[model samples]
Target chain A: LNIEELKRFLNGQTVVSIQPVTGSPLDKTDFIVAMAIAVEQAGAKALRIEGVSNVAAVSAAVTIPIIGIVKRDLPDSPVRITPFVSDVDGLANAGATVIAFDATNRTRPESRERIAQAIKNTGCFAMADCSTFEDGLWANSQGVEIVGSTLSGYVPTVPDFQLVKAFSEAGFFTMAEGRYNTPELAAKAIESGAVAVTVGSALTRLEVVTQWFNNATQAAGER
Target chain B: IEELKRFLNGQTVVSIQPVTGSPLDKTDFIVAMAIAVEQAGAKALRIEGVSNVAAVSAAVTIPIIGIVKRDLPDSPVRITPFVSDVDGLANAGATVIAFDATNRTRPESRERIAQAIKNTGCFAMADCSTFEDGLWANSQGVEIVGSTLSGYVPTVPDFQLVKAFSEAGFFTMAEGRYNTPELAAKAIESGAVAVTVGSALTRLEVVTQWFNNATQAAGE
Candidate 1:
């Protein structure tokens, strides 16, 4: 989807997440703001905030282009993030400028086109979180404004630069996400034709970052 | 405070921070590594937590950016989250006290945190996550700002912090994600008065993963 302000804001800037992961963070609305303020403290011009309550919390605390989405867990569904039409309204009302949804090539409760429209109707930019270039193309054709490789690793092989490039070449503003997990990978996503990139669990959600340390510990011990 | 600036003047201080989650020999063993960081030519020691700061501070005469990570009953404040944390870090021997001066709620207010550091006579460095965060902290009279908090203030690019800090008229130190020698130099080019790197130079438990990933990638 398109939000001129957010597009202008992130043109050449890095968008970061301070998603709490691991075992050591306090889960509170004010704390989310506290941590998000800290997250924004490093000089980020914008933020990608999940959770409906956090949207209101951070949006009220900081005036930035807020990319918002609500993560939902549906029984009997593989899609766990911003899946339903109802979720978009929650996000938009909570002050999300862009509504990101799970547009992967999997069983979706509603079609991707419907969700994208639902997102747009809320007066927010609609983004399709896809697995492959084909998924991005279909969602883009269906009026989705932005396409992201958010489900790359979970639904397919992690975010592929080739997929990102193809989506770009086809006239779609592609966002490379998912296991653009490392800083190096995140940087490379831009090089690979992604207009923007969204890094997840790798940044916070420390359980994952801990894996790098775990493997590193193994390699160090072996040596 | 002037001494810290003078000490960091024209220098790349290898301030070390350690982490461990693996079943390894030095699993979360930070104090010993603090000594190792000094021995290995780190210009200063940046320690988090009272124990590590005290242990490292007592052992080294070099400048130390001491921090205390604390969580309040209903708040998530880290890096000197409270006024007492500021006092604890000061007593623990921190040359500078780095605290979260972002736009969030905490155990105390930014004014209180700054006052505590000022009361201690130690330099107050805002471990800022964004340009505005640094700007606000600077407004509150923090001695300086550090890009060290960028990787998660939603991760500022390595080159982004220096320019932002300089433009805001704050004496900036690069830390947090300053992960490499080349990265440190780029930070200098960007406007950092001093740059700090942690695991890239120390913590074999973490560094080995960087190499192992490349090696595994080679196998692929």
Candidate 2:
């Protein structure tokens, strides 16, 4: 279950990067493996593939360390990261070296300890996607090896720098993701103590880039 | 007011106040005033903090630019009381947020607020007393600069501030006690990115006071 070679490869690099195959806007696992291959060809250091089918296809296609996550919405739980223990096992079986889950303080069906134990028994790195410093602290206490800034916008509490600083000082490898649009912002995150940065639509989506250009130009013209 | 927008749309600028005798917590009054501005087709609206920003933003769809007015004991101006205030305004959905960009004791340092603005994905406007303040704010990556502090400090005339801001390659907004069409046009001619005339347009007290003062002076 443990990919020691993948772990070594990720630990040695200055940047542990991934290109997510989020599929279509409608369903999970839509175009995941195709997106993973595109990312691999573009020289991504690692892959963060979502959904079981996408993970399976990505694993079959690439040798790079695959950080697998299953974004599923359950009826009673607002938690989206791998809905249940069964989903986690499926992703692990599909060749996910790391397993990430929603570790917010908000109510969820699975407890942090249970998720952490499952990830540990399966020999995969446990990443807690958290928003607040308290969440990061709690996740770390529950045995998460890595933490990411995914929920920063939800609570509207501390600024991004403070969140990154808290995780870094706590000895967790802070991964800065979400709403990172500009190069200046990415540089600022790294300066603020992010171990690695994840940039998505800014590099991938042509439509978004075009929109930004149009908005800036219109703002400039108005000025 | 109608003419001001005709000349000032798309000009990134700051909102200025005359600091006249009125209630300090003018939140509701400001929101009412912004409704009028929206009707007149103003692209962006700026208002002092003191709860007015949150009020005005709730009432308008166009970007609401905000500044907190707290007369700190150590500072001369109180556009933004603190960096946390800017954070609050951004959370309230003020698309472009501003603070006193004056050369005086700013409650939040230029570097700190500028960085905070970038992090929040909201544009920051700097209110400058002089060209030096404008340059300093621009260097710090502030997206907009205003001449609001100029006439209040008398560091430069409104026209001079506009010209200086233009020459320095900054998006200049003319603010601070502009009460007449003549002054607004002069600012535009001087290369102001936009001109904001607040009391002349919104505050009834100032409008009536101007009329009374002119008549009394004529009688004297």
Candidate 3:
């Protein structure tokens, strides 16, 4: 889709990113597809999916826009989320309408501009997951379509709300993600000038929820 | 208690062994982790610290198996190495008390420690590294045996210890590196009454490493 077309498509909606919890190959797509169905059925307007077949599975299941990413654990490469152009190509091939990549200033496989341009060449929308406002500004200046505060805790000390407001003020479509677990936090991100919020773990991760319960219950004994 | 016999029974007994001296090993940390583990499907907990045991016992209504871990001088038996350690754990609300039941000579004899555990009205759990260790515990009147010391002992492989303990007519639990669901089930098939897996289920760092390894292998 064209940049204007994609921007018009996801201008205002909650994107539920369902990350695959296991390191298993996505050749098995049942779990991811089922998760996508549940998320969309409940309320999510769009889906941010990782892994090749996971993206493919969710794409086939829902009519909503899909954001695709590939997470790699390459020790030598600092850029893990959709690090290479091959990732963008795979995601697009798997029917990802938009490709989200690590646009942080950390040492990456190559320049974020190069990756973003590659994504653009595939005729897919590009979303930058930034560690700082500067990272988002850098990517946006280079013609990246969307900017997000997705890497706040990983590096940037600046709050995600501030990142969203700065990026929005700078005339880019800003997305607020990054640990917005509660409904109030999500609403606050929008009130602070974000166009959309991407909710992950709090909704899709059972292991984390179980840990949350365990931590609270255990702490109660200490008090 | 009858269902503790029926479902194997329907029990999700997992162990949460925190880094005892780490900054995160405080009573608050253990208590919070205990709550999470219980909510995540742990029907029972095997805790190895006196105060840590007391905190979790008071927090949860489930039965707690407790022991105090202390480094002992002139004794290889470290886990609940003395009668005093057994008494401390029992007093701290340990429904089941576990102690080192190996052949290593300690300040207090195995018989005395068993007597101490029995005195507190708590059941005795023996951590045995060898078949002979299980027999020694059996002769001294332990109610159960667990293969916790198998991996640490020089000659005892952990896989065989649980089966040996159960075949000897003692009710035995399987622990010590049962990291997979299949291995835990295999222990039961080999005659273990139940299994306790630590680090595998509770520790995020360990679980992350496992996934990282898998990710690398799949990528390669």
Candidate 4:
């Protein structure tokens, strides 16, 4: 589908994000595919998935559009989410309808121009995973299709409502993500004028939920 | 050490529980913890739940003493009480399936759970609270009897039960409250083939509580 159609599909809906837990014993691709099917059946509008192979595998199993990303931990850089120019073709060829990458104004391996051009080259919708308003502006300058609040809490934060509203009012297709983990919070994101809300850990991460319970118990016991 | 290995492989094995500190998938987290414990030279693992048993078994070479813990209102039995639990644990790669062989009103007969373990081609460890329970486990041809439920019926690690089981020609694992190094060695001396220590190792919350209580008491 085109960028307009993809944006329309996600408008006012919750996109569930599924990423493999680090150091998993099970097959990574198979796990993502299984989780993608589970969330899709449970009424997810779309999915934000990491890994090219996982996106490829999940796309075949579910009918919903996949927002794909490649996470590369570079030693010399802080950029992790789809930071390289080469990641675009891999994700696009693997059936990602929308490809999201770190559009943060940090020292990155690939220039913003080249990355946006690569997404445009493949005919896949571009989602600039922005950290600040300036990053969204930079993404807009590159004519990127979507601006997502995905990197707000990575440094020290939650879902940045200001960024969502700023991007939405800036005439950019806004996706509110990163710690928009509850139904009420997602509703707030929609109210804040985000085209869609991407919920992760609360919907997909059981291990995180278990940790919360354990922490709660430990804290209560300590008191 | 080999003699210690003899007790379990012949052992007091450090059991690793799923502490799940991170956002790791349950199977992934347990398997990683199992591997880490095995690599750090633990002889065996004590794992609960069937999926965790299967995953840990595939990932680690160490022997796993598997048990299914369930809360039943009608029965006091919790550790592998039903035959279904025994079947699931054994098939899921438990070398020995530990069950509640204590004399309590349970969902299934002790003999039936033992028989199920036997049918699955896995060794059975009867979690016994009393010396009489060991004898009963022996009567049913169970291979190992654990002093796991000693304090629960309850007492400290039942050194006397271990001694009795050994004398009666049944292999025994000294479990429950064998927490300290001296206590673990004492269990070995008391004729236990192996010992299982809880709280001192795997249970982080219990150990923290112990420390918290001690510090508070000292400060006061």
Candidate 5:
């Protein structure tokens, strides 16, 4: 895929994130492929996928680009998003046209610089998933292609529009991710100058979406 | 929730059709909405599409009245118009397969689609626009008839259509714009075995917009 052309396609579009297991045991590659196709049919410009296998499956099923990550809950560290050079290489080989990695200040298995370099070596687009504006600045200085406010919620239950604005003013391609559930909120992200808004649970996490309804309805019933 | 008639068996039960939100419809999301509505006391669910049908069927014990909405060329029929759709829904574990039994032009005859549904051991439901459609479904041995297209084809909450179907000995389901609790009760009074409410309950986007748009208008 043409890296710059993919960026142009993603500009001012909504990128849906689909996890392999979405809190359900019955989830598998078939489920992921089905979900990818459903979202594609719904007109998603791109997909933010976790796990190399899921990236491979979704890539095959949909025409849109996949921003792949490998999430590992390491005992030694808090970083979980593509924390290793090998993970970056694996995602690129598995058909991730764009690779997103944690660029937080926290210690991890590999340095942000190393993961960034590994993604660059694969000739794929790079996205630095950052928790702070400083992380965005550092990643931009290191030659990363995109900056994302993905890790901000670990740092809202709300999106970091300030991070998006800061990155936008600095001339870095930024994505607003995390807790952007409503049409109004997502529109606000684009107004904040994010190149794209990546929404996960709001669009794909069905269990949580149902929970929102359940909580409200149950409360009404009780009242 | 077990038997297909369970919906028609008791007092006018409510079936929620959460009308899977716009722009994107994921299987997991549909399944979750199914579970949510079921938990909130819905006796049955009206789900669309094959993937959603299979996933919701696997996860819930509630009777799913499944339909595949397809736009046909040169035909106004959009609900399970083909015999193949009945097989697909049945294979996906739909307890009840709903199809358009409207008087409009369709790809397949309503009787053929009903027979296909029965062959797969699923109950056949005719989503009718008029009482005449219900009469035809009854003559053809279709099990259920719903006023699903009453509004699409009115000034709906078509209780008169429901009463006509009930008087004709057809198991009638009152669907279409029975949004208010009072309207739902009226549907039951009109002789519907059950009533389906979608936008008032499951369609969060429309519901939210209803309030938002109304409030904004008042403010302006």
Candidate 6:
């Protein structure tokens, strides 16, 4: 889909991008791509992909904006946005319209510029994975097009409401994406002024869903 | 110690103390403070020990993080001055101990109080001024480091402290004068191990002060 089409779809709409599982016993690219297709079918405006290979697979399977990211562990740095320029370059080359990375003060393998510059050079939107209000503001100052609440509880940042408000007030496209495990919280995130809200395991994650159901059943039985 | 342990039975709690007065009297205040914190939800208590550890331990069941706040001749504040203080806290039934871990100075070898706390087999919280301090505390073997350095010190932002702790791999509790919900949430987002909403949640006086400040600022 074109950027305008994607933006129109996402405008003021909360988009839930189902996470595709990689690096496990069940590294099923087909299943993952199918999930994205299903999400798109279910009316998700955009898709968030974790790896370059997965992004390509998902892109081939679906016609939606792919927000690409690469999770990497770095020594002496806590920032894990894309971890390096190569990740941004690779993801952009894979046809991702948005490149998301950690923009928190936590140390990363590469500089924020590497990722920001790549996004600029490739004409892809740079999404800052921020957890706090300051993080959002800082990212906005740095010219990020989208500020996301993806690093909440993963790093130090302000609470959801504050971050949402900061991004919203600063006129940045604020997307709430992390630790939202309940519909209630998701609704609250939107009410708190999130331009878009993303829910992961709450919508998928059969194991977690089953556990929740079991807990509900047990609680109900007790009651 | 036995009494304090018995008080903490079957409860999850934490303790806090104010560190701006006479050491001996501060100990007594900390005892009352621990009881109040424990009553609210803390399974354990933290206090600056001068004599308060003994008094507070004598009064409560929560494990105490005993600290001694003494101003050294050359330093700013000495909380938990030496191994002796560690022993004293242990003797007084403190399950944990805390010390200033600014990476600036260590009472013994500039090795940080986390090292001393380790030597004594007590869980230690490094009260740091920055994320760098928290990382240093973690490296020095602190079980937890207070996200205590967030707002009070302007050098390192609270979110950065929370992020640093997450990055450095430590149990980071968001503490210090977090006077706003936004700050609290940001701290949690920044990867605080847990959040301690102290005076903001508990102390009405501080809350009132915050309101006054906000109102005044708004008026301006």
Candidate 1 chain A weakest ten by summed lDDT: A214-223
lDDT of 4 by residue, B90-155 (tens): 789988888998878988988888899899998878889888888898889888888888878532
Off by over 4 Å in 2: A1-31, A156-159, A205-207, A218-223, B1-220
DockQ of each: 0.03, 0.02, 0.03, 0.03, 0.09, 0.01
Clashing residue pairs in candidate 5, if any? Answer: none
- Tens digits of per-residue lDDT, candidate 3, A1-223, equal 5676655555555667777356322123665675566545544557888888888878888887899999997777677898888888899999998899999877776777889999989888889998887898798788888889998778532346877888888888888888865545666676677777787665555455445433333333232
User: Least accurate stretch of 10 residues (summed lDDT) in model 4 chain A?
Assistant: A214-223
Please provide TM-scores computed only on chain A for all of the candidate models, following their numbering.
0.88, 0.80, 0.91, 0.94, 0.94, 0.86
Q: What is the C-alpha lDDT of each candidate?
A: 0.66, 0.63, 0.71, 0.73, 0.73, 0.60
In model 2, how large is the Cα lDDT of residue A140?
77
When sorted by lDDT, best at the front, the candidate numbers are 5, 4, 3, 1, 2, 6
List where candidate 6 sits over 4 angstroms from the true fold.
A1-6, A20-26, A156-159, A218-223, B1-220
TM-score of chain B of 4: 0.89
RMSD, each candidate, Å?
15.5, 21.8, 18.4, 12.6, 8.5, 22.0
Candidate closest to the true structure, highest TM-score? 5
lDDT tens per residue, model 5, A26-93: 24666667667765654566788888888888888788888999999899999988998888888999
Give the number of the best model, judged by DockQ: 5
User: Per-residue error at B47 for model 6, in Å?
Assistant: 58
Model 5 off-target regions past 4 Å?
A: A1-4, A20-26, B1-44, B47-59, B63-151, B154-220
- Superior by lDDT: candidate 1 or candidate 2: 1
Q: Give Cα distance to truth, residue B207, candidate 5, Å.
A: 16
TM-score of each: 0.54, 0.45, 0.52, 0.56, 0.63, 0.47
- How many angstroms is residue A60 displaced in model 1 relative to the true structure, after the best TM-score fit? 0.8
Please state the Cα-based DockQ of model 1 relative to the true two-chain complex: 0.03
Which TM-score value belongs to model 2? Answer: 0.45
